[PDB]
Amino acid sequence: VYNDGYDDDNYDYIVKNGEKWMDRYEIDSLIGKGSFGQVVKAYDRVEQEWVAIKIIKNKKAFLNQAQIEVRLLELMNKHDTEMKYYIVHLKRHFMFRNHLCLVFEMLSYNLYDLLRNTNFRGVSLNLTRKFAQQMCTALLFLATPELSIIHCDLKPENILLCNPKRSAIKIVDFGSSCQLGQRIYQYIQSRFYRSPEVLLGMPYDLAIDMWSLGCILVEMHTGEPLFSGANEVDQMNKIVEVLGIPPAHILDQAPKARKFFEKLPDGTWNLKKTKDGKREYKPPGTRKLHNILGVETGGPGGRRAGESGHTVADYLKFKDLILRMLDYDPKTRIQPYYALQHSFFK
Numbered sequence: 001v002y003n004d005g006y007d008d009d010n011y012d013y014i015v016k017n018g019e020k021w022m023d024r025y026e027i028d029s030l031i032g033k034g035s036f037g038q039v040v041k042a043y044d045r046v047e048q049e050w051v052a053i054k055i056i057k058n059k060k061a062f063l064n065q066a067q068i069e070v071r072l073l074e075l076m077n078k079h080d081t082e083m084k085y086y087i088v089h090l091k092r093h094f095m096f097r098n099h100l101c102l103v104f105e106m107l108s109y110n111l112y113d114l115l116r117n118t119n120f121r122g123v124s125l126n127l128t129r130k131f132a133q134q135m136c137t138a139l140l141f142l143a144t145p146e147l148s149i150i151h152c153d154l155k156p157e158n159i160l161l162c163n164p165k166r167s168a169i170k171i172v173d174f175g176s177s178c179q180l181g182q183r184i185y186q187y188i189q190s191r192f193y194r195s196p197e198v199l200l201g202m203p204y205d206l207a208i209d210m211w212s213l214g215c216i217l218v219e220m221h222t223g224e225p226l227f228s229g230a231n232e233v234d235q236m237n238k239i240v241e242v243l244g245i246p247p248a249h250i251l252d253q254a255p256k257a258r259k260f261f262e263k264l265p266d267g268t269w270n271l272k273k274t275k276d277g278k279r280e281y282k283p284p285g286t287r288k289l290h291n292i293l294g295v296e297t298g299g300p301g302g303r304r305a306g307e308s309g310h311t312v313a314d315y316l317k318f319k320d321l322i323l324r325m326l327d328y329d330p331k332t333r334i335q336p337y338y339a340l341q342h343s344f345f346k
């Protein structure tokens, strides 16, 4: 017996379809489970609409992190009001039977489900452009000085379609987010979307979300993760395959530089060599983004020959924006305001 019979043995509320809360919410179904707790679909009888309710684990560490999430969401909707910056809206939060509950607007499926529905052929570059433009606008809103919110977990699963037919999207799940002045975790971002500065144990800021976005946008058009590392060493090596060795002025400040790279006696950094006799990674910078996108060969799978918005010129603009987003240097990596001025969006 936990929490008078309402919790399982892992601090999760035992969800029962049809249960009514506070004469208002009718719990309909489980829609997701995570380390923070659970997310259920529920009908809000008072407002006559569906909602998604995040039920935080009945346990202090998860309660405290979600209390930060609530504060960040409340800060955001104090600066948004009209919900025009593609951020999920917190409708309400409350305690119910020793669980912090976060009520969000109901949304459609996430960008990974969309990819799986294309059987990982990817979506068109035109739809990728629309998603990119809305995400850069969302990041510009996060970069508002009073906010300065780092999401820290941008990935296709955390971007939801508003309606299954429309192209409008929203960023969800600020459960790991922090303001720039209040960073507290070091092992952050899901691995495929993790920035070099996080991999390198360096201090991080809002530029790490732009790195995730660049990775996300390529995957949305190709159907496959750009950097699908199985662990931290593999992830950096897949990054290096495409982008080359990071600038020396970065690695010379990098607490974990020697987890991946070696300094040669003459100051120039190289990769740590793979173990005798196993196939090497492709040499640094030789897995060209140019060929991943299929810039000159009809895009991914050669499927886009003659398609509008997929000319070589369009692919070259997209490639350029991606490389600006995948800059190793978080000071020079393109910023939301300037990504919005990029010719990819013209």
Ligand SMILES: O=c1oc2cc(O)ccc2c2oc3cc(O)ccc3c12
Residues within 6 Å of the ligand: 031, 032, 033, 034, 039, 052, 054, 088, 104, 105, 106, 107, 108, 172, 173, 174
């Ligand atoms: O915040 C979230 O975190 C999650 C974490 C998971 O592991 C799975 C699903 C969710 C999830 O689905 C939603 C649907 C909405 O309409 C709004 C918010 C969310 C939301």
